[PDB]
Amino acid sequence: SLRYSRHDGTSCVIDNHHLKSLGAVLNDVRRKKDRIREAEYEPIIDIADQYMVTEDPFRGPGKNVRITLFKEIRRVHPDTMKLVCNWSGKEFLRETWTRFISEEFPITTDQEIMDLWFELQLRPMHPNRCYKFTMQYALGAHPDYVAHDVIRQQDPYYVGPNNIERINLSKKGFAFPLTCLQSVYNDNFERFFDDVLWPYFYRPLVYVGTTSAEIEEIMIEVSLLFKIKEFAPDVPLFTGPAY
Amino acid sequence: SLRYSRHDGTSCVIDNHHLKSLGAVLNDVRRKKDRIREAEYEPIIDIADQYMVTEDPFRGPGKNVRITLFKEIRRVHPDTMKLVCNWSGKEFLRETWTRFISEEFPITTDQEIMDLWFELQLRPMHPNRCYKFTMQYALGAHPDYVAHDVIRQQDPYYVGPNNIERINLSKKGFAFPLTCLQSVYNDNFERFFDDVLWPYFYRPLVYVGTTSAEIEEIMIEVSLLFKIKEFAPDVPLFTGPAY
Amino acid sequence: SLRYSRHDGTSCVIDNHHLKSLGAVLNDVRRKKDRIREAEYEPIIDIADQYMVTEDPFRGPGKNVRITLFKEIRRVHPDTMKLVCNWSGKEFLRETWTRFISEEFPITTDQEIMDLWFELQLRPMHPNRCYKFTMQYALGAHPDYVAHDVIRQQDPYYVGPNNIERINLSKKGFAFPLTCLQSVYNDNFERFFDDVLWPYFYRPLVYVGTTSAEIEEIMIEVSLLFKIKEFAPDVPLFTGPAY
Amino acid sequence: SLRYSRHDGTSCVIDNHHLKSLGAVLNDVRRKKDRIREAEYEPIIDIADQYMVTEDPFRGPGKNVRITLFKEIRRVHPDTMKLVCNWSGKEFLRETWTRFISEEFPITTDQEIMDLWFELQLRPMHPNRCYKFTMQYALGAHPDYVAHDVIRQQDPYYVGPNNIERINLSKKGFAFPLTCLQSVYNDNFERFFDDVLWPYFYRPLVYVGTTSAEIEEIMIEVSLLFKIKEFAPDVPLFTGPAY
Amino acid sequence: SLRYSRHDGTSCVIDNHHLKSLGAVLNDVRRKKDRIREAEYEPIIDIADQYMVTEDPFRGPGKNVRITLFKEIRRVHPDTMKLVCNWSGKEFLRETWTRFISEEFPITTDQEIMDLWFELQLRPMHPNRCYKFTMQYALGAHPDYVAHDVIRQQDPYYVGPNNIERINLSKKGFAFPLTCLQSVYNDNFERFFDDVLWPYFYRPLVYVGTTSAEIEEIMIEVSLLFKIKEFAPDVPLFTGPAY
Amino acid sequence: SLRYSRHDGTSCVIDNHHLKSLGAVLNDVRRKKDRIREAEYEPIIDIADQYMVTEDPFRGPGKNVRITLFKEIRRVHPDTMKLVCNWSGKEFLRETWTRFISEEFPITTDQEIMDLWFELQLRPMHPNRCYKFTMQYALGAHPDYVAHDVIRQQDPYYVGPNNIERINLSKKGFAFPLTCLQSVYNDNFERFFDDVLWPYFYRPLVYVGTTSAEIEEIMIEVSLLFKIKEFAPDVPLFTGPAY
Amino acid sequence: SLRYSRHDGTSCVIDNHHLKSLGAVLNDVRRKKDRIREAEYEPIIDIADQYMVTEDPFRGPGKNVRITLFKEIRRVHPDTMKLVCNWSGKEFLRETWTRFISEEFPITTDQEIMDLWFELQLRPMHPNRCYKFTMQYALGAHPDYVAHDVIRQQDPYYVGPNNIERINLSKKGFAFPLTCLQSVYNDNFERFFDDVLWPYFYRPLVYVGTTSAEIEEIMIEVSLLFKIKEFAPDVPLFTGPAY
Amino acid sequence: SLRYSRHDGTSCVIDNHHLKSLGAVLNDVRRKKDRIREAEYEPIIDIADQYMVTEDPFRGPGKNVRITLFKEIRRVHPDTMKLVCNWSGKEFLRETWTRFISEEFPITTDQEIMDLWFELQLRPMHPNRCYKFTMQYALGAHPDYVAHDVIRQQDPYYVGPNNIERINLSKKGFAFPLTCLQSVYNDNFERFFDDVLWPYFYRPLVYVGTTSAEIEEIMIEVSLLFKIKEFAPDVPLFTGPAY
With an 8 Å Cβ cutoff, are H213 and A130 in contact?
Answer: no
What is d(CA C180, CA H60) in angstroms, rounded to the nearest whole number?
91
Tell me, yes or no, if D228 comes closer than 8 A to chain E by beta carbon: no
Tell me the HSE value of C132 on the side-chain side, using a 13 A CA sphere. Answer: 13
Question: Residue E145's closest chain G neighbor by CA?
Answer: G182
Chain G hits for F181, CB-CB cut-off 8 Å, are: 138, 140-141, 145, 147, 205
Cα distances (angstroms) measured from residue B203 to each of B82, B146, B169, D75, G37: 17, 12, 10, 91, 51
CA-closest candidate to residue E114, choices E231, E232, E233: E231
H28 touches chain E (CB under 8 A): yes
**Bridging pattern class, strands F63-76 and H133-140:** unpaired
Whether E132 has its CB under 8 Å from any CB of chain B: the answer is no
Which residues have C-beta within 8 Å of that of residue C128, sequence separation ≥ 6?
F129, F130, F131, F212, F213, F214, F216
Helices assigned H by DSSP within C165-228: 189-195
Please tell me which chains touch E, using 3 or more CB pairs under 8 Å as the contact test.
B, C, D, F, G, H
Give the Å distances, CA to CA, from A132 to A71, C193, G27: 19, 97, 30
**CA quadruple A174, A177, A183, A185: dihedral, nearest 10:** 130
Dihedral of CA E229/E231/E234/E239: which sign?
negative
Strands H150-152 and H80-83, by their bridges, are antiparallel
Residues 6 or more apart whose Cβ sits within 8 Å of residue F77: E234, F150, F215
The residues facing G12 across adjacent strands are G19
A37/C1 Cα distance (integer angstroms):
13
Dihedral pair phi/psi, residue C92, rounded to 5°: -60, -45
Mutation target among G36, G38, G40, G44 for the D interface, most CBs of D within 10 A: G44
Q: Among candidates B59, G13, G32, B167, which has minimal Cα distance to A49?
A: B59
E173 and chain G: CB distance < 8 Å anywhere?
A: no
What residues contact G196, with CB distance under 8 A and at least 6 apart?
Answer: G93, G175
Please, which residues have CB within 8 angstroms of residue H105's CB and are 6 or more apart in sequence? H184
The reply to whether C119 touches chain F by the CB within 8 Å rule is no
Contact in structure between A61 and B157 (CB atoms under 8 Å): yes
Query: Are the C-beta atoms of residues F62 and G156 closer than 8 Å to each other?
Result: no
Tell me the pairing of strands D133-140 and D157-158: antiparallel
Interface check for C167 against chain E (CB to CB < 8 A): the answer is yes
Cα angle for residues D174, D178, D183 (degrees, 5° grid): 170
How many Å apart are CA B140 and CA B200, to the nearest integer?
Answer: 9
3-class secondary structure per residue, H8-66: CCCEEEECCEEEEEHHHHHHHHHHHHHHHHHHHHHHHHHHHCCCEEECCCCCCCCEEEE
Q: For C51, phi and psi rounded to 5 degrees?
A: -130, 165
G63 touches chain E (CB under 8 A): yes
* DSSP bridge partners of H67: H224
Q: Which of E42, F56, F208, E47 is nearest to D11 (CA)?
A: F56
| Residue among E151, E205, E155 nearest G231 (CA) | E151
- Kindly state whether B146 is in contact with chain E, defined as any CB-CB distance less than 8 angstroms: no
Question: Of E111, E87, E83, whose CA–CA distance to E177 is shortest?
Answer: E111
Strands C11-14 and B164-169: what pairing?
parallel
β-pair partners for H129: A129
Asked if E39 is an interface residue toward chain D (Cβ–Cβ < 8 A), one would say: yes
H189 Cβ contact list (under 8 Å, min separation 6): H94, H97, H98
- Tell me the residue type at F134: T
Q: A63 CB near a chain B CB, below 8 Å?
A: yes
Instruction: State the Cα–Cα distance between residues E124 and F10, nearest whole angstrom.
Output: 68
Sign of CA dihedral F87, F91, F96, F98: negative
Whether G148 and chain F come into contact, CB under 8 Å, resolves to: yes
Sheet holding A202-210, edge to edge: A150-152, A80-83, A202-210, A133-140, A157-158
| Helices and strands counted in chain F (H then E) | 3, 12
Which secondary structure element, helix H or strand E, spans residue B38, and what is its range?
A: helix B22-48
Cα gap E237→E233, rounded to integer Å = 10
Taking only residues 68 to 97 of chain B, the set having a beta carbon closer than 8 angstroms to any beta carbon of chain C reads none
Contacts of D60 in chain E (CB under 8 A): 17-18
Burial of C17 (0-12, 13-18, 19+ CB in 10 A): middle
**What residue of F is the nearest CA neighbor of C211?**
F128
Spatial separation of the C-alpha atoms in residues E234 and G153, rounded to whole Å: 52
Is the bond preceding residue H241 a cis peptide, omega within 30 degrees? yes
Burial of D242 (0-12, 13-18, 19+ CB in 10 A): exposed
Q: Identify whether the C-beta of residue E181 lies closer than 8 Å to the C-beta of residue E109.
A: no
The contacts of residue G240 (CB under 8 Å, 6+ apart) are none
CA distance F188 to chain E (A): 30
Q: Rounded to a whole number, what is the distance in Å from the CA of C32 to chain B's nearest CA?
A: 16
List, in sequence order, every residue forming a beta bridge with C133; answer none if it has no partner: C210
Q: Inter-chain contact E56–G54, Cβ cutoff 8 Å? A: no
| F164 CB neighbour count, 10 Å cutoff | 20
**Are the CB atoms for G215 and G124 separated by under 8 Å?**
no
Alpha helices per DSSP H over chain F: 22-48, 89-104, 189-195
Size of interface C-F (CB pairs under 8 A): 26
Indicate contact of C with H: 3+ CB pairs under 8 A: no
Query: Do G132 and G158 form a contact (C-beta atoms < 8 A)?
Result: yes
Return the DSSP state at A156: P
Looking at residue D115, its amino acid is D
Euclidean distance between CA atoms H197 and F38, whole angstroms = 60
- For residue B193, what is the enclosing H or E element? helix B189-195
Report d(CA F147, CA D91) in Å as an integer: 86
Q: In whole angstroms, what separates CA B10 from the centre of its chain?
A: 47
Structural Rg of chain H based on CA atoms: 28
Reduce the DSSP state of residue D36 to 3 states and report it: helix
E39 vs C92: CA distance, rounded Å? 52
**What is the rounded distance in angstroms from the CA atom of residue E82 to the CA atom of residue F166?**
43
Q: List the determination method.
A: electron diffraction
Give which of A60, H139, C144, A179 is closest to B140, Cα–Cα. A179
Instruction: Kindly give, in sequence order, each residue whose CB lies less than 8 Å from that of residue H243, ignoring residues fewer than 6 positions away.
Output: none
Distance CA A183, CA C98 (A): 87
DSSP track, H134-198: EEEEEEE--TT----SEEE-SSPEEPPTTSEEEEEE-TTTS--SS-SSB---S--HHHHHHH-SS
Measured between alpha carbons, how far is E94 from E54 in angstroms, rounded to an integer?
A: 33
Query: Hey, how many other C-beta atoms are within 10 angstroms of the C-beta on E111?
Result: 22
Bridge partners (DSSP) of residue H68 are: H223
Helix H segments across G49-168?
89-104
Give chain E as a DSSP string. Answer: --SSTT----EEEETTEEEEEHHHHHHHHHHHHHHHHHHHHHHHHHHHTTEEEEE-TTTSSSEEEEEEEEEEEEEE-TTEEEE-----HHHHHHHHHHHHHHHH-S--S-EEEEEEEEEEEEEESSSS----EEEEEEEEB-TT----SEEE-SSPEEPPTTSEEEEEE-TTTS--SS-SBB---S--HHHHHHH-SSTTTEEEEEEEEES-SS-EEEEEEEEEEEEEEE--BS----PSSP-
Q: Of all residues in chain C, what percent are helix, strand and coil, respectively (each to 5)? A: 20, 35, 40
Instruction: Count residue pairs from B and C with Cβ separation < 8 A.
Output: 52
Q: What is the DSSP string of E161-204?
A: TTSEEEEEE-TTTS--SS-SBB---S--HHHHHHH-SSTTTEEE
Residues 207-226 of E with CB under 8 A from G: none
CB contact under 8 A, F48 and B25: yes
Beta-bridged to residue C214, according to DSSP, are: none
Which is it for the CA torsion A181, A187, A192, A195, positive or negative?
negative
Q: Phi first, then psi: what are they for G52, rounded to 5°?
A: -135, 155
Q: Which string of b and e fits A182-208 if b means at least 16 CB within 10 Å?
A: bebeeeeeeebeeebeebbebbbbbbb
Q: Which residues does chain C have within 8 Å of residue F128's beta carbon, measured at their own beta carbons?
A: 129-131, 212-214, 216
Write the CA distances from B184 to B100, B107, B188, D151, integer angstroms: 13, 7, 11, 101
* AA identity, residue E91: E
Per DSSP, the residues of C45-56 read HHHHTTSEEEE-
Partner-chain contact E56 G61, CB within 8 Å: no
Q: Give the integer Cα–Cα distance in Å for H52 and F25.
A: 9
Beta bridge partners of B12: B19, E166
Residue of chain H whose alpha carbon sits nearest to that of A129: H129
Q: Inter-chain contact C161–E18, Cβ cutoff 8 Å?
A: no
Contacts of E54 in chain G (CB under 8 A): 51-54
Query: How many CB atoms within 10 Å of residue G46?
Result: 17
Q: Where do runs of H (alpha helix) occur along D49-195?
A: 89-104, 189-195
> Smallest Cα–Cα separation from C91: which of C223, C203, C226, C224?
C203
User: H or E element: which one contains F54?
Assistant: strand F51-55
For Cα atoms D159, D161, D163, give the angle at the middle one, nearest 5 degrees. 55
User: CB–CB of G222/G85 below 8 Å?
Assistant: yes
Cβ D47 vs Cβ A29: under 8 Å = yes
Q: How far is E241 from chain F (nearest CA, A)?
A: 22
Distance from CA of D19 to the nearest CA of F (A): 9
- What b/e string do you get for D31-57 counting C-beta neighbours within 10 Å, with b at 16 or more? ebeeeeebeeebebbbbbbbbbbebeb
Q: Which of D53, C47, E26 is nearest to A8 (CA)?
A: C47
From CA C208, how far away is CA C74, in angstroms rounded?
9
Q: Which helix (H) or strand (E) holds F136?
A: strand F133-140
> What count of other Cβ atoms lies within 10 Å of the Cβ of residue G14?
9
Question: What does the alpha-carbon distance between residue H178 and residue H185 come to, in Å, rounded to a whole number?
Answer: 10
Element (H, E) at D42: helix D22-48
Closest CA to F3 of H48, H49, H32, H43: H43
A68-93 in b/e burial notation, b at 16+ Cβ within 10 A? ebeeeebebebeebbbbbeeebeebb
Give Cβ neighbours of residue B214 (< 8 Å, ≥ 6 apart): B78
**How many beta carbons lie within 10 A of that of residue A50, not counting itself?**
19
The closest alpha carbon to H27, from H10, H5, H6, H13, belongs to H6
User: Are the beta carbons of E55 and G54 separated by less than 8 Å?
Assistant: no
**Which residues touch D168 (CB under 8 Å, ≥6 apart)?**
D115, D116, D117
The residues that bridge with E64 in the sheet, in sequence order, are E227
Residue B36: count of CB within 10 angstroms of its CB:
13
**For the packed helices D22-48 and A22-48, what is the interaxial angle rounded to 10 degrees?**
110
Question: Rounded to whole angstroms, how far apart are CA atoms C118 and C222?
Answer: 8
Contacts of A33 in chain D (CB under 8 A): 41, 44
Rounded CA-CA distance E190/A61 in Å is 95
Report the sign of the C-alpha dihedral through residues H199, H202, H204, H205, in that order.
Answer: positive
Contacts of D42 in chain C (CB under 8 A): none
Inspect the interface and report whether the beta carbons of A25 and D41 lie closer than 8 Å: no
Nearest CA in chain G to F58: G155
Nearest chain E residue to D39 by CA: give it.
E2
D and A in touch (3+ CB pairs within 8 angstroms): yes
**DSSP strand pairing (F63-76 vs F150-152):** unpaired
| Residue of chain A with shortest Cα separation from H213 | A127
Burial B61-88 (b: 16+ CB within 10 A, else e): ebeeeebebeeeebebbeebbbbbbeee
Distance from CA of C211 to the nearest CA of F (A): 9
Q: Report the C-alpha gap between C222 and C74 in whole angstroms.
A: 13
Residue C211 contacts residue C79 (beta carbons within 8 Å): no
Could you tell me if E232 lies within 8 Å of chain H, comparing CB atoms? no
CA distance G146 to H36: 48
Length of chain E: 243
Closest C-alpha among F186, F226, F193, F185 to residue F103:
F226
- Report the distance separating Cα E205 and Cα E203, nearest Å: 6
Map residue F14 onto helix, strand or coil. Answer: strand
Give first-to-last CA distance, chain D, whole Å: 46
